[PDB]
Each structure stands twice: as structure tokens, then as C-alpha cells.
Amino acid sequence: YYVDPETTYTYQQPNPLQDLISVYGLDDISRQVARTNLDGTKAVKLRKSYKNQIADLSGKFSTINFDWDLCSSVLSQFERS
Amino acid sequence: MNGNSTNNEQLQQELATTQDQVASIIESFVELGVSIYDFPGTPEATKGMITNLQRNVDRLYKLNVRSNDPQSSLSDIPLEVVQYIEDGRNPDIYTREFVEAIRRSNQYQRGKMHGLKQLRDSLADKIVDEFPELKEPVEDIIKRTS
Amino acid sequence: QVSLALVIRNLTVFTMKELAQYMKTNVHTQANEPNSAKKIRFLQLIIFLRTQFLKLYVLVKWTRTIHVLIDLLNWFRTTNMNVNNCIWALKSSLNSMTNAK
């Protein structure tokens, strides 16, 4: 009854059965931040936030219309007092 | 292929320049804070403070101008990422766990696809077996699905 | 998608507004307050602005690393809740059609 030879359904693209990571050559970043290396050992220690991305900079991150000349002069007068 | 590589190189160079400028701004701010904390009040120190403030303002203005260029290659950060990065760490466990959930979802998808495939294969086989007269549409059904 | 240039411009505008407000407050603040407290407040404001600019620095570094993982991640998420929505729609359809049974 509903068998229509004119109604053809095409495969969904991209196919989830195939390796969707390698479809567009998207393996570099996945390998970069992979859970484990090819041998299964842990690559780097893992944590949560962005703090360790600023550790190289100097500092102690323990806890994580307009007249510029006039303001500079005011600050200079305040400091000289 | 060459155009994509050239665009990537230009974007990387622009981002490296922005990174260097912001690092210089941060270093200048650190020096400004150090001078403020250890300010002796001498006129030379006051002139140095004024010069440092002017340099910081000029650097910020230049960064704002360059980063706002429509032709620059700079032109997603979800709020959940901002919430997660507020915990004083090295940002890896969020990606680890969420990629683990992604892989679990993908494995579930593949397993359910295999299960459904075997389901409809067996159903087609038995419908052909006990109902040969409907065998011809069933294969077409596969052609309608596959 | 939010453009990085717009975010940078908004951050710079907010920094300028905060600096202008701080300068104005120091202007109309009575001179009886010691200069040490004003210097400490200015240092704290500078530290906060530096922290915001360092967050922008980290975002810039992330974009330099950048989208491939982000694109795959978003596509897989979309597939996941599309499957979940299909399951929920199936359950709702059966619940509705049980009456017609």
C-alpha cells in the first residue's frame, strides 16, 4: 500500500558507523589531549581550571571623553603630597 | 590547499603577536604595581609612574584597535567553560570527562545501530520465510532503508 | 557564535569605564583619607584589571591552539540529544496512542 518505488531515502551523512573523527582529518587535536597515549600510560597530569596556564608568568596566584593626562597629573599631585 | 595553509599561518602569526602584546601589557602592569607598592615619592619616581601609566594606556589602546580590525583574522567560549576555569587548576579534567561522555554516547550509538541492523535483518528473513508472497517488497524495503 | 573582537572591545570599554569611575571617586573623595588607602585601592583595581586581561590572554592562547575538537564535540553532542529527543518522542507517541488502542 505504502510501497512507493519513487520514494528513495539516502544514507545519512556523515555515517555514524564510520570513524567520524578521521572523516575530516580531525585526529591531531584529539591525539593531543587524548586520555591516554598509544601505550595506555598517562601523558600529563589533569586538572580543572586555567590557573596553570599563567604559572609561567611572574606572580603569586595563590587564590583564583576621558582625559588621561589630567588623571595622571591628579595622581602625580596626590603622590607628591 | 595552499590558501588554507596561508590563512592558518597568518592567523597563527596574528595570535602570536596578540599574545606577545598582552604579555607585555601584563608585565607592565606588574611593574606598575611594584612601583606603586614601593613608591618613594621622589619627583623622578613620579615622572616614571606617569610614563608607565601613559605606556600602559597606549598599549591598551593599540591592543583594542588592532583586535577590533574587521580585516584581521581574529574575527567559541561557552559560559560553562568560564565557570569551570574558575577553580585554580590546569584545564584537563573537564575535557577528559566530557570527551569520555562523548565516547560513551558514540559507543551507545554504534551498539544500537548494530542491534537495529540485526533486528531488521532477522525480521526480513523471517517475513520472507513464513510469507514468501511478501518477499519482494521486503527487499525493496531494505532498498528503501539502506 | 560570539566574535572575539566584540568581546575584546567590550572588555576594553568596561576597563575604561571602571578606571574613569575610580578616578572620579578619587577626585571627589575628601582629602582627609590617607594616601596609603587610595594607593592600596588603586593597586587592587590594577590587579583586577590585570587579571581580566590575563583571562583574555588565556582566551587568546586557546584560540591560537584552536575548533576541530570543538566542532567534533558539538556535533557528537547534537547527535546525542537528538537521539534522546527521538526516544522521548517515541515514548510520548506511545503514551498518546495507547488511548486509541
Nearest CA distance, B124 vs chain A (angstrom): 15
Segment holding B2, helix H or strand E: helix B2-37
Q: What are the cell numbers at B87?
A: 577553580
- At B11, which amino acid appears? L
CB B142 within 8 A of CB B124: yes
List CB contacts (< 8 A) between B41 and chain A: 79-80
DSSP A11: P
CB B43 within 8 A of CB A80: yes
Query: How many C-beta atoms surround the C-beta of residue B95 within 10 A?
Result: 17
- Identify the chains in contact with B, defined as 3+ C-beta pairs within 8 A: A, C
Chain C interface test: which of A66, A67, A73 (most C C-beta within 10 Å):
A66
The answer to whether A68 faces chain C, any CB pair under 8 Å, is: no
> Of B81, B8, B89, B22, which Cα lies nearest the Cα of B56?
B22
List CB contacts (< 8 A) between C53 and chain B: 22, 25-26, 29
Residues 6+ apart with CB under 8 A from B46: A76, A79, A80
Cis peptide before A14 (omega within 30 of 0): yes
Residues 6+ apart with CB under 8 A from B77: C2, C7, C59, C62
- Identify the chains in contact with A, defined as 3+ C-beta pairs within 8 A: B, C
> Of C8, C92, C3, which Cα lies nearest the Cα of C55?
C8
Query: How many C-beta atoms surround the C-beta of residue A50 within 10 A?
Result: 25
Q: How far is CA B30 from CA A15, A56, B57, C22, in A?
A: 53, 14, 14, 19
Rg for chain B, CA atoms, rounded: 31
List CB contacts (< 8 A) between C71 and chain A: 26
Using the beta-carbon criterion (under 8 Å), do B23 and A57 form an inter-chain contact? yes
Q: Which residue has the cell 587592587?
A: C44
Residue B60 burial class via C-beta count within 10 angstroms: exposed 0-12, middle 13-18, buried 19 and up = buried
CB B74 within 8 A of CB B15: yes
The answer to whether B90 faces chain C, any CB pair under 8 Å, is: no
SS3 assignment for B50-108: HHHHHHHHHHHHHHHHHHCCCCCCCCCCCHHHHHHCCCCCCECHHHHHHHHHHHHHHHH
Nearest CA distance, C64 vs chain B (angstrom): 6
